[PDB]
Amino acid sequence: TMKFMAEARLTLTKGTAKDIIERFYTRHGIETLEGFDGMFVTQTLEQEDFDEVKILTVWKSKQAFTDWLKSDVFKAAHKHVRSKNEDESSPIINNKVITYDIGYSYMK
């Protein structure tokens, strides 16, 4: 079932992680995708200059994730999302996307 993971790694103004994280309590339709299995939003411990928040998403296939990226619900979730280069008031400093095959999983 859980075969592919996509991560968005966000670099944020120090101290703004809690505010960004609370936004994830509200669904925007990712849950409607048959291929979507789950998500974790993490804050990296022991960071000096910036906060780091990772959004980890777990999928039945790479295709489920690639379709999501192109979907209306992805657009809806990210409609009002701006990075500092687009809106100076945004705490989002940098973003990188990393993808993975999940070779083994076990949820207790």
Q: Return the half-sphere exposure (C-beta side, CA atoms, 13 A cut-off) of residue 98.
A: 9
The two tokens of residue 46 are 């022991």
Q: Tell me: does residue 44 bind a copy of itself (CB under 8 A).
A: yes
Ramachandran category for residue 56: left, alpha or beta (phi over 0 → left; psi -120 to 50 → alpha): beta
**Which residues form the interface with ligand HEM (CB under 6 A)?**
6-8, 10, 20, 23-24, 26-30, 39, 55, 57, 73, 77-78, 81, 83, 92, 95, 97
**Which residues form the interface with a copy of itself (CB under 8 A)?**
2, 5, 17-18, 21-22, 24-25, 27, 31, 36-46, 53-54, 58, 98-108
